[PDB]
Amino acid sequence: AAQTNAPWGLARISSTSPGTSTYYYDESAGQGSCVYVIDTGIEASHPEFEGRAQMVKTYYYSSRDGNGHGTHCAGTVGSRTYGVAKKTQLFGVKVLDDNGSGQYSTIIAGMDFVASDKNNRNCPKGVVASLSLGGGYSSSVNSAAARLQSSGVMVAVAAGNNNADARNYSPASEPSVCTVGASDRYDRRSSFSNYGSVLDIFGPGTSILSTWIGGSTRSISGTSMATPHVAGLAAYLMTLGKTTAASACRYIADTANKGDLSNIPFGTVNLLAYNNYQA
């Protein structure tokens, strides 16, 4: 399949070169997989989700996305126009308040929620979780993300927007999950992107167009926006039967565009997510 005039990040993940604007992908498009977006919530009524998104858990007075962040990320995972996996199912977990912050204990309880709730859903092609959030180092936030991965869910988490080593952040520093940096349209590391040996992959993160609350759209930047590109890709690759939840981050890194990014500090991987689709 081919989507003309796609957002630059979608076109990049199916190209060996920057500067294109068409996204190519197998038409299975993630059918039969599920992605949890653990964030500020999802505006499920957005016409871009086509009835494939819904809220399943909130820790606040409303499960509504009064912020926009959670909606933006969920659109990069699986909205018809801005999504990687255009036929996957989206499950919203609201662990951040409408100001975009949340306690660590609420974030941990959301992660344990998904590790059990996938047993209440139909996902015969596999389960992905996208965690567009983070803060300071916490061994108990790291361990919650390890448990979720171990339960059979591919976990993708943001490196962080501090322009520092991601070792001092959680759950970016958990080694068994998939830590995602951010790149821009000229194949440069985003100026805000964290780095380090803990990073596993880079995704498109600067000026990413996607859904917004009120049925709108806008373009924002962050390792929070590279993370749903990889999360959607994993759901796409598991539908095609090319990998499982336990080895999706490893598979994505093996099949990635190698040595194409600039301003990657020594000791950090130089890998850009790539769907390897031959139309």
Task: Name the catalytic one among 14, 15, 46, 69.
Answer: 69
d(CA 152, CA 189): 31
133 touches 169 (CB < 8 A): no
Annotated binding site: 16, 175, 177, 200, 260
* Secondary structure percentages of the chain, helix, strand, coil, to 5: 25, 25, 50
Question: In the annotation, is 224 catalytic?
Answer: yes
Tokens of 239: 């539908």
Q: Which of 15, 173, 193, 224 is catalytic?
A: 224
Structure tokens at 187: 């194949």
Backbone dihedral region for residue 163 (phi beyond 0: left; psi -120 to 50: alpha; all else: beta): left
Q: Which of 14, 15, 39, 170 is catalytic?
A: 39
Distance CA 51, CA 161 (A): 32
Query: What is the separation, in whole angstroms, between the first and last Cα of the chain?
Result: 7
d(CA 129, CA 37): 6
Tokens of 162: 């501090």
Binding-site entries for Ca(2+): 16, 175, 177, 200, 260
Side-by-side strand order, sheet with 53-58:
53-58, 89-94, 34-39, 127-131, 153-158, 178-183, 201-204, 271-272, 257-258
- Which residues are annotated as catalytic? 39, 69, 224
